[PDB]
Design a binder for this molecule. Sequence first.
Ligand SMILES: [Mg+2]
Ligand SMILES: [Mn+2]
Ligand SMILES: [Mn+2]
Ligand SMILES: [Mn+2]
Ligand SMILES: [Mn+2]
Lengths: 304, 305
Amino acid sequence: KIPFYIMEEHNEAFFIWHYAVAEGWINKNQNTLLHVDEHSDLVVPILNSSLKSVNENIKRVHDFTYSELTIANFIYPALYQGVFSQVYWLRQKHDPKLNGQKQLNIYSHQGEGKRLILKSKVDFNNLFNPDCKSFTITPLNAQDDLSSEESKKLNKSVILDIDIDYFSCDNVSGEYLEVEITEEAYYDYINNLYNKLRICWGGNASVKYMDGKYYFCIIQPDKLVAENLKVSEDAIVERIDALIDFLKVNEIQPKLIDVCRSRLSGYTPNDQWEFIENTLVEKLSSIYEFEPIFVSELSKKVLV
Amino acid sequence: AKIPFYIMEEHNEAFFIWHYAVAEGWINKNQNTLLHVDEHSDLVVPILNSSLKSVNENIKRVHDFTYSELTIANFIYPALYQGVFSQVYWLRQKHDPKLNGQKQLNIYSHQGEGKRLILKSKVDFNNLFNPDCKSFTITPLNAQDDLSSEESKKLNKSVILDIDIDYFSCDNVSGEYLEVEITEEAYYDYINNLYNKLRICWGGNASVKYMDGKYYFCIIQPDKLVAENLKVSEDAIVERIDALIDFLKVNEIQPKLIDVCRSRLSGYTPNDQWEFIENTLVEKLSSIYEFEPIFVSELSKKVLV
Ligand SMILES: [Mg+2]
Ligand SMILES: [Mn+2]
Ligand SMILES: [Mn+2]
Ligand SMILES: [Mn+2]
Ligand SMILES: [Mn+2]
């Protein structure tokens, strides 16, 4: 049986990886992240906690995961800790400019493990620096014919990290961020000349009134440049089958599989997420042996 | 002849002052130089709800737009798109070493509507004779720079002296700190729900706080202690004001309009220094220029009548 885990939001993947190392399902380091997602999740985080200290025990990892980790900044931390030595990002259609391997290195400011710094060329000072980790991020497609040399390089301690929004996505519902505010806060935003929030926070940011309630729209997606990434149930099935073929052809045997719904964040359509998860698990069960366990089960063992 | 001199609280108000200066005829409609003396570039490209073509119609319209869609960092490119300035010179204490020489840039609006601004490094073939497309330069400067006669000649044309007092002494941590009053429901969902969208999207870059029976959502800097401190001493401030006054004398700068921004309500200028910086700056500017400083409120007064 392959360890198989399902989470609501992607930051939880960090907790699952460290749990797997603790139980010994995957190795301490030199693992491969097969990151199957519409988004790269390669935001370089600044953290309050040192990633050196977070690693010590699983209870500390759990608290960090649901505190400082976002749904787009959870990979570079795992790379800085040396959990993965190479990342393969699988997408429906990649940007044309970005193609082939990318030789990168990550270190923290003054070795504190708080402010991560990304570089293409390894600095002379970071030569034989334990803080500095070298790795490669590669853009792949499910329809890519992979060479015998490239196939060998990918197939080393593989973690199959799948976000359901890979198959069908809604960036408009996903990007949109709001918080309910008081009438006093709403009024000051519009009418106060020097309301810091209006004149210091740009983009599409706004305040709105609905149902006798007030909201600060922190982030509104640009609907003019928004692509229609929501596809039919047939297109989803086709896309899931294409992933199975990529895994079959490259003879991928994961040491850990994790699935992210991304339906509470709204990136996966709310009327599809059940169909995509159910169909994926069915299709994954045809080539792999596993028992799907919800991430809550891991939390309960840690909290007690 | 006195130089029109206007003091404002926040930098978005500069846009209003520039268009007022055009309407009165203190400066020309176009081909002005923006001498931008500030710690921050204020070169955010804004996507707007109002067309910048329509905003320019009358001064009331400009005033409404300034206190609506503008931020303290996106007020320059709208003025460049409207053709108010043909070149910007950014005066900073210490620039990025990579940033050298004049940057040949052009700005145009999506479909010529004047709502969505698009910034480019080279003029697109379609925008070669397009009157919606404006060509300009943005150049870094230092107060210690000795300009050539060719350089000084190029720069010293219809100058607007645009000073943000955060150039002399700055606090980016105080300036970047934002908080908004939220409801009980919003506060307790953030606290109890692990999948609350504010939590999972922003993590340690945001937080919530309870103060005097009220709830706030706060945008915060993680590892705040390690963040840079640009707050300097009064002596350093005086030395830096003298350095500017010397640069203005040496290059024989005679501004058609001076505007000063406090940035103390936004908190970019330290609250214990802003009065000292402003008073010293105005005192040492009067040693090389003749003017009577007027607060931006007096301009707003006339428009709303
Ligand atoms: Mg706005
Ligand atoms: Mn993801
Ligand atoms: Mn995703
Ligand atoms: Mn400014
Ligand atoms: Mn400034």
